[PDB]
Amino acid sequence: VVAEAIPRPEDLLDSPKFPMFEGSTGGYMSRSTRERHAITWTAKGQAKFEMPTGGFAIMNQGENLCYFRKKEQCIALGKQLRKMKIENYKIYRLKKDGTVIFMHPADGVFPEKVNKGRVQVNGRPFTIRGNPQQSELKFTKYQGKG
Amino acid sequence: SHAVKIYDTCIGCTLCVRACPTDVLEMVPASINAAKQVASSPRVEDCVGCKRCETACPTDFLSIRVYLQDNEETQYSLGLDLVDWS
Amino acid sequence: IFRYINTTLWAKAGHFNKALSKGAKTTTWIWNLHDYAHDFDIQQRSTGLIARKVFSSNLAHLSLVFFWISGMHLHGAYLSNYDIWLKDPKSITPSSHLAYSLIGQDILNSYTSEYFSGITITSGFFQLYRSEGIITQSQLKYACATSLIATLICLSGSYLHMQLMSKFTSFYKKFQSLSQDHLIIIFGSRSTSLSAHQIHKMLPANPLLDSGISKPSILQVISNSLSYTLALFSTNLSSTGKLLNPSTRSVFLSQVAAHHKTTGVVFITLGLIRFLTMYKSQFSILTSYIDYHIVLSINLALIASLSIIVADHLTRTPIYPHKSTSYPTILCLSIHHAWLSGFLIIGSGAHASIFNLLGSPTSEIRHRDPIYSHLIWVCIAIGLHSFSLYCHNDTLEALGRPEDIFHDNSIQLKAIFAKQSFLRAELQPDIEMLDKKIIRITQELGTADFIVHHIHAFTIHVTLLILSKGVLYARNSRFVSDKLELGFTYPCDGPGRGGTCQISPWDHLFSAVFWMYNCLNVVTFHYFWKMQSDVWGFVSIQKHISHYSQGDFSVNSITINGWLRNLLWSEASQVIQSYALSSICPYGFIFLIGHFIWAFSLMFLFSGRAYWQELIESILWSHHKLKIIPHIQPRALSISQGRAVGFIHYTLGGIGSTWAFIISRLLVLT
Amino acid sequence: KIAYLQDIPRTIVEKDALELILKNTPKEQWENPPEDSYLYTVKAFAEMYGPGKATKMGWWDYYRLKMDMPDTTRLSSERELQEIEEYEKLMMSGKVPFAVPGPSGYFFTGFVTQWKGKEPFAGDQVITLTENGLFAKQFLSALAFYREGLKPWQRGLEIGMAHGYFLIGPFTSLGPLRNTPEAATVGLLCGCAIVGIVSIGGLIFGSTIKPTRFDKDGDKPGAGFIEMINWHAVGGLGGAGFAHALITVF
Amino acid sequence: REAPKVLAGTGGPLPESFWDPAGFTNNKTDEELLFYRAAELKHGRIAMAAVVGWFTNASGFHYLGDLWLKKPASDNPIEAFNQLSLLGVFQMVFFIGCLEWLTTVPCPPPKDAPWDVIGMSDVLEEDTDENPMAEYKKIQMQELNNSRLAMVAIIGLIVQATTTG
Amino acid sequence: LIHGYSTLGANDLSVQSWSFLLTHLAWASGFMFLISWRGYWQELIDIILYI
Numbered sequence A: 001v002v003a004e005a006i007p008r009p010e011d012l013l014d015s016p017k018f019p020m021f022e023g024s025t026g027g028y029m030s031r032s033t034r035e036r037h038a039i040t041w042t043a044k045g046q047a048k049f050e051m052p053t054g055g056f057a058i059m060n061q062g063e064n065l066c067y068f069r070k071k072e073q074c075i076a077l078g079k080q081l082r083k084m085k086i087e088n089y090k091i092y093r094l095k096k097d098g099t100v101i102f103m104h105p106a107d108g109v110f111p112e113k114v115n116k117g118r119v120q121v122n123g124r125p126f127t128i129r130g131n132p133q134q135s136e137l138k139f140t141k142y143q144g145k146g
Numbered sequence B: 001s002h003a004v005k006i007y008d009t010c011i012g013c014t015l016c017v018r019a020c021p022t023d024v025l026e027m028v029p030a031s032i033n034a035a036k037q038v039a040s041s042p043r044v045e046d047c048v049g050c051k052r053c054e055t056a057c058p059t060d061f062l063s064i065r066v067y068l069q070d071n072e073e074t075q076y077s078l079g080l081d082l083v084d085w086s
Numbered sequence C: 001i002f003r004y005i006n007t008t009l010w011a012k013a014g015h016f017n018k019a020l021s022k023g024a025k026t027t028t029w030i031w032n033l034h035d036y037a038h039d040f041d042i043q044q045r046s047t048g049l050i051a052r053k054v055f056s057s058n059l060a061h062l063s064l065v066f067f068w069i070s071g072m073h074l075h076g077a078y079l080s081n082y083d084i085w086l087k088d089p090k091s092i093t094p095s096s097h098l099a100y101s102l103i104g105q106d107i108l109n110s111y112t113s114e115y116f117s118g119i120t121i122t123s124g125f126f127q128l129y130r131s132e133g134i135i136t137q138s139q140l141k142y143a144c145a146t147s148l149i150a151t152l153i154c155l156s157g158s159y160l161h162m163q164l165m166s167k168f169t170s171f172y173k174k175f176q177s178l179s180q181d182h183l184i185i186i187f188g189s190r191s192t193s194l195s196a197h198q199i200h201k202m203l204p205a206n207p208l209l210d211s212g213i214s215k216p217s218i219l220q221v222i223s224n225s226l227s228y229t230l231a232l233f234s235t236n237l238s239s240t241g242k243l244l245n246p247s248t249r250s251v252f253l254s255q256v257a258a259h260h261k262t263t264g265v266v267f268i269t270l271g272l273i274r275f276l277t278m279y280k281s282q283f284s285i286l287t288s289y290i291d292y293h294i295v296l297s298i299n300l301a302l303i304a305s306l307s308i309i310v311a312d313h314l315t316r317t318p319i320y321p322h323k324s325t326s327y328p329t330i331l332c333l334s335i336h337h338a339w340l341s342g343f344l345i346i347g348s349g350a351h352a353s354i355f356n357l358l359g360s361p362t363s364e365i366r367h368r369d370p371i372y373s374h375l376i377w378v379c380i381a382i383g384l385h386s387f388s389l390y391c392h393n394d395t396l397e398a399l400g401r402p403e404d405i406f407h408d409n410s411i412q413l414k415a416i417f418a419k420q421s422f423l424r425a426e427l428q429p430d431i432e433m434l435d436k437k438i439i440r441i442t443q444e445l446g447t448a449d450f451i452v453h454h455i456h457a458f459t460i461h462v463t464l465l466i467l468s469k470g471v472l473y474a475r476n477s478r479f480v481s482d483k484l485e486l487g488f489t490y491p492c493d494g495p496g497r498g499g500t501c502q503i504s505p506w507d508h509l510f511s512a513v514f515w516m517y518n519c520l521n522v523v524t525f526h527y528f529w530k531m532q533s534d535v536w537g538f539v540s541i542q543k544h545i546s547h548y549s550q551g552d553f554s555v556n557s558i559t560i561n562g563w564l565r566n567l568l569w570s571e572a573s574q575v576i577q578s579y580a581l582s583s584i585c586p587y588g589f590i591f592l593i594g595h596f597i598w599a600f601s602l603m604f605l606f607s608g609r610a611y612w613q614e615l616i617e618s619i620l621w622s623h624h625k626l627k628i629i630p631h632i633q634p635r636a637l638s639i640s641q642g643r644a645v646g647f648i649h650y651t652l653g654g655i656g657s658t659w660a661f662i663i664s665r666l667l668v669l670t
Numbered sequence D: 001k002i003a004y005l006q007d008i009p010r011t012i013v014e015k016d017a018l019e020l021i022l023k024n025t026p027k028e029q030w031e032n033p034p035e036d037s038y039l040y041t042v043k044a045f046a047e048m049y050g051p052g053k054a055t056k057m058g059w060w061d062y063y064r065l066k067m068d069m070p071d072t073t074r075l076s077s078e079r080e081l082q083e084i085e086e087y088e089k090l091m092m093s094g095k096v097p098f099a100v101p102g103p104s105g106y107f108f109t110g111f112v113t114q115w116k117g118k119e120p121f122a123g124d125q126v127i128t129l130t131e132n133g134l135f136a137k138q139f140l141s142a143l144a145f146y147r148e149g150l151k152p153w154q155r156g157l158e159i160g161m162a163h164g165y166f167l168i169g170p171f172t173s174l175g176p177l178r179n180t181p182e183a184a185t186v187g188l189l190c191g192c193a194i195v196g197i198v199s200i201g202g203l204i205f206g207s208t209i210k211p212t213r214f215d216k217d218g219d220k221p222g223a224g225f226i227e228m229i230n231w232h233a234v235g236g237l238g239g240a241g242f243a244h245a246l247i248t249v250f
Numbered sequence E: 001r002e003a004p005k006v007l008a009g010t011g012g013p014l015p016e017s018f019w020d021p022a023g024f025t026n027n028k029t030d031e032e033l034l035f036y037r038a039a040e041l042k043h044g045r046i047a048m049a050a051v052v053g054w055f056t057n058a059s060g061f062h063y064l065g066d067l068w069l070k071k072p073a074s075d076n077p078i079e080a081f082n083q084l085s086l087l088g089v090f091q092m093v094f095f096i097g098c099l100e101w102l103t104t105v106p107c108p109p110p111k112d113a114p115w116d117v118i119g120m121s122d123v124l125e126e127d128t129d130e131n132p133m134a135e136y137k138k139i140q141m142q143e144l145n146n147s148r149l150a151m152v153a154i155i156g157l158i159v160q161a162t163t164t165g
Numbered sequence F: 001l002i003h004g005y006s007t008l009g010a011n012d013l014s015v016q017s018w019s020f021l022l023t024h025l026a027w028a029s030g031f032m033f034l035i036s037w038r039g040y041w042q043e044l045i046d047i048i049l050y051i
Ligand code: CLA
Pocket: C376, C377, C379, C380, C381, C382, C383, C384, C387, C388, C391, C462, C465, C466, C511, C512, C514, C515, F025, F028, F029, F030, F031, F032, F035, F036
C-alpha cells in the first residue's frame, strides 16, 4: 500500500478535490489544533452526503478530499460512504510536521474482512471468567490490572 | 488509552468490528471456531470507549471486553476536538 | 373497503411495530409496546397509513374533548348549585362536583348554599355559562346533548377516515387549502358567528340579569323576544376596558360581541389578503417544513404562547361576569394556562428535535455554536445577576445592613420600561370594586417586580438553552459525530470519551421539563403572592384597602427568606391546618401526597438501572427456587424509561403540591 | 414520449395543473412517479380512465379523485422554483444570504456574505461581519494587545490605565462606604486591589503558560508577557489614581 | 457619463435616474464623486437617527435628561436641548468625536467605497447572480432614498420648530 | 428560625436562618449533578470552549 501525499490543510486552500460542502462552525478548530485527519475517496456520481461536522455536501465525480479534526469523524464519513457502495476510501492522520500516517484500511483490506498476515493482538486464550483474581496479583506487575 | 481484550469465546461475528466508530478492531485468521477467524484490537489507542463492540457481541458473555481507564485518558480516548494534545 | 377493519389484531398486541413481533420475551416488551403506541412514523406499512392514523387520532381526541365538555355540562345541569349561583353569585361558591358519603368522604363536601353541599369548583364554568346566557336547566341539558352528539360524530368520523383515506389521499398535504379554509371559515366566519350568538342571546339576556330581573319574567323576556333593547344598549360611550360593568365587574358583553365581529372581519380580510402578500422570504421555511413533526412543533409552540397570553389576559382584563371577584377561579384560570403553556412549549422543542432527526434541518444549524454559546453566556449573566440580587439582599439583611440591599427603601432598581408602560389599560387614576372585593387595581411595579421579572427571564432563557441545544445538536456534535444514526431517543453512546450520558434530544427534553417546571413555579408564586399582596382583598368604606397578604410582597419578596417565610410558610397555614375542615381536607391530603410523589421520583432520578436489574435477579432466584418462573422475564426499566418515570413523578408531585397549596388558601380566604 | 401523460382527460386533471405538476416534479420521476406523489396518482388513474378506457366513474370515486389531485394552488410556480434552485446553489457554494435575527425570526438583508473561510474545513474561519469585516479586523488589530510597533510595556500601560480608571467607579459608588464623606479613597483602594489581583493572576499565567508572542528574539521565554503584566499593574495604579483625582478635584 | 458610472443606478426617483439638475457631478473626478456619496450617506444615516431621536424625544421619552435634570424636560426637542445639563451635551459631543476618530484614522473605510464604515466589502459579494440574495443594490436604494427623505424631513422639523413652533 | 432576619430586625438566630437557606441551596444544587448526566454538559463545555 502506498500512502498518498496529503498536504497540510492550511497549505491546500482552494483545491479541486474538495467536495462542494456548505461549511459550518463544526469544522476543525484552527488556531488551537494542528493534528488533522484527512479522508480521500473516488466516487462515480455527485451524490449528496452529510458532513460529520454539520452541513451537507456533494461529492465530485472524480477524486474527493476532506479534512477533519478527529479520526472518529473520518470513520463516520467512511461508513456513510460505504453505505453508498463507495469502497477505496483511505483515511490519513496528518501530524503537525505534515507527516502522513495511513490509518483506516491499514493493510488495504477493511477490518471486517479477514486478511492474511494479521495476528490477534490483545488476545486472551480463555473465557472472560478465566482472568486471575485481582487480590492474587497485589504489588506484582499486575497490581490493579488482573 | 483503554484496554480492549478479545477472548477465545469469539466466533468471528465481525459485528464488533463493524460497530467500532474509530477502527480499533479487526478480523484475524484463527482456528478456534467454525468461522476460522477471531477479532483483534491492534489500535486501542484510538478506542474512545463507547462499548458499542460489547453491545454487538452475541456470545453468552462478551468475547470482547473493554476496560475503562480514566486516569489513563489520552486525546484520542477522550475524543478531543477543540483542543490538540500534540 | 371496511372489510379489512377486523378485530384479529386486538388480541395480537404489539402488531403495529415490527420490533415487537418477536413476542413478549421480557418485561421491556410491555414498556416498548406502550412507548411505540402513538409513534405512527415508525410503525408498519406505507406513508398513507401514517396520514390516516394521524388524522383519525386527531378526530378521536376531538371526540374525547367533546365528551369532557358534555360531562362538564351534565354536571352543571344535574349535579350543581348553578341556580342559586345565578341568583346570587357573590354569596355562593360555584360547585358542580359532589362526593359520595363513603369512608367518611362526606367530609369533603362543604357548605356552598343552604340547599347544596359539594366541592367548590374553580374551573370558571359557571361564569362561562352566565356569559353564555344559560339560565334554565333545559339549556344545560341541550348543551350536554349537543356535546354528546358531537362526541359520537367525531368518533364515527375517526372510525370512517381510517378507510375513507387511501394510498392516493392528499388533502392533508394541501397546505394552501388548509390555511385558507381554516383562516377564513373558522377564524373569520366562526368569530362572526359567535358575535351573532352574543348579539342575539347574551345582550338580550345578560343586560336583563344585570337590570336586576333575575326573574326576566321567566321565559316571557329571557326567551329572546326582546327586540326593543337595542344591541348597544349600555355601551355608555367610553372605551372598551376603560369602564367596566359596575354590576358584574367585567367588560360589557356588547363590546365583546363587537370585538368578535371585528376580529372575524379582520380574519376574513387577511384570508383575502393572503392571495397577494409578502412572501418569497419564508419560502425556504415553506418548502422545508412540510412534515408532521415540524408542523406539530410549530403548532405546539403557537398554542402554548396563546395559552400564556390567555393566562395573563384572563385575570386583569375581566371578560367574564362575576369572575374577577371569584378569586380562586381567577387564580386557577391564570395558573392552569401557565402550566399548559410551559408543557406545550416543551413539546414544541421535542418535536423540533424529532423533525431535525427525521427531516433535514435549515441554515441556522450551521452556526449553532455561536447561537447556543451566546445563549449560554446570557443565561449565565442573568442567573448570576437576577438571583444574586436576592442572595445579596438576603446576606446583607442577615448581616443587619438593610440600607445596602436592593429594595424600594434602599438601593432601588426601578422598572423603567414597565413604569413607562402605562400604555396598557391606561385606566383612570383609581380602582374598581364590586362587593367588598377588589375587581382590579393597577399593580404598582417596584424593585421586587423588577427582580422577579428578571428571574422569569433567566429561567425562560435557560429552558430555551436546553431546548435549542437539543434541537441544534441532534444530528451530530463535536462529541459524537454520528448522533443521527443513534435515532431520536437513546440513553447514551457509552461511557467512552469521558462519558456520553444524556446526549440525545430526548434527554435534552428530559432536562428541559425540569427547567420549565422550575421556570413557571416561580411564575405561579410571583402571581400568587403579588395578586394577594397588591390587588386582591377586602375594602374599607373610607377608600382604604386591606389586601389578603397585607402588602407583604414589596417588603418581603426582595429576599429568599421572604419567599420562604411569607409565602411558603405563612400562606401554607391554610393547607397544612386543613384536616377535618370540610372543604379543604382533600387539599391537605393531596399536599401530603404531592410531597410523597415528588420525593418518590428521586428514586428513579438518582439511580441507574443496573442496580435494580441485579436486585431483580436476586429476587428472581427466590422465585425460581419455588418453581415460580415468569416467562416474561423480569427486566428493570430501560434508562430512558427510568428518566421518563422520574421526570413525570417529579413534575406531578410538585404540581400537586402547589395546586393544593394555592387552592386551599384561596378557598379559605374567600 | 411518456404514455400516460398523453390525451389525459381534462376531467381527471386540467392542462395547466398537469403542466405545473410536471414542472414541479423532477424530470427523472415522470416515467415512474415514486409513491405519494401527485404524479403517482395521475399515472395510477390516467391508465384506468381515458378515451380508450373506462370513461365514467361513480360520483364518490370521482369526488375522492378530485381530492387527491392538486388544486392548482398548492404547487410552486416557476419563480418559486427558481428561488429554491438558486438558494440551494448559494448555500452549497459556501455563500449565505445574509439574515439578521429579529422578533422571533430574521430579516433577510439582501447580501451575499461569503461564508466558508480560506480553510473551508476549518470551523473557526467561517468569516462573519463582526470578526472578519474590515472595521472589525482593523479594530481588533489596533487594540493595545495587538497594535503594531508597541513595546510590551506600552501595551501593559495602556491596558492598565483603562482598567484602573474604570475599576474605581463600581466601588466608590454603590459600595459599602458609598455615603461616607470620603467614599472615594475606599473606591481607590478597592480598585487598586482589583488591579493587583488581576496582575498577580497575569503573573501566574506568564509563569505557567509562558506566552512567547511578545518576547523579542533571544530572550527568556515569557519575558514580554511578564513585562506587559507588570506595566499593566503600574497603569492600573495610575488610572485608578487619575480617576480618584478627577473625582476629588471635580 | 464615465465617472458618474461609479455611483450609477443608485439615485433618482427610479433607481437608475442620475438626477443632478445642477451639473454638480459632471467634470468631477471619480474619487470626488465617491467622496460626494460618502458625504451623502453620512448625512442621511445621521438624519435617519436624527428623525428617530426627534420623535422619541418629542413624544415624552427623555429618560436620561429627565433623570439627570430631576424634572421632565420639555417635549420640544430644541428646547429640551437647552434644559439638558451641560455635562450631558459635552459627553455627547465627545462620544461622537471618538466614533468619528475611530472610523477615520484607526479603522479607515476603503478608498474605492468610502462609505463602508462597517466594512462589508471584505465579506460581501455584491457581484453574484442569485435572486434570494445579491439584492444588495436594492437595499442600497432603500438606504439612500430613506436617508434623503430623512435629510429634508429633519430640516423641516428644525425650521418649523425654530419659526412656527 | 424564619423570623430570624426579616424586615423587622434580626435575632441571634440570623446565622441559623442564613445557613438554613444556604444549605437548602447546597442540597438543591447537587440535584443537577445527580439528575443531569455527563454528555449534555460535555457538549456544553465544548460550546463554551469554542467561545
Ligand atoms: C438550586 C440548585 C441549582 C443551581 C444553583 C443551578 C445552577 C445552574 N444551572 Mg442547574 N439544575 C438543577 C439545579 C440547580 N442548577 C437541577 C436540579 C437540574 C435538573 C437536572 C438542573 C439542570 C440544569 C441544566 C440542564 C442546565 C442548568 C444550568 C445551570 C446554570 C445556569 C444558571 C447560571 O449560570 O447561574 C449562575 C449560577 C448560580 C448558582 C447563580 C448564583 C450564583 C451565586 C449566588 C453568585 C456567586 C457566589 C459567589 C461568587 C461566592 C463565591 C464562592 C465562594 C467559594 C467564594 C447554573 C450554573 C444551565 C447551564 O449551565 O447553562 C448555562 C443548563 O444547561 N441546570
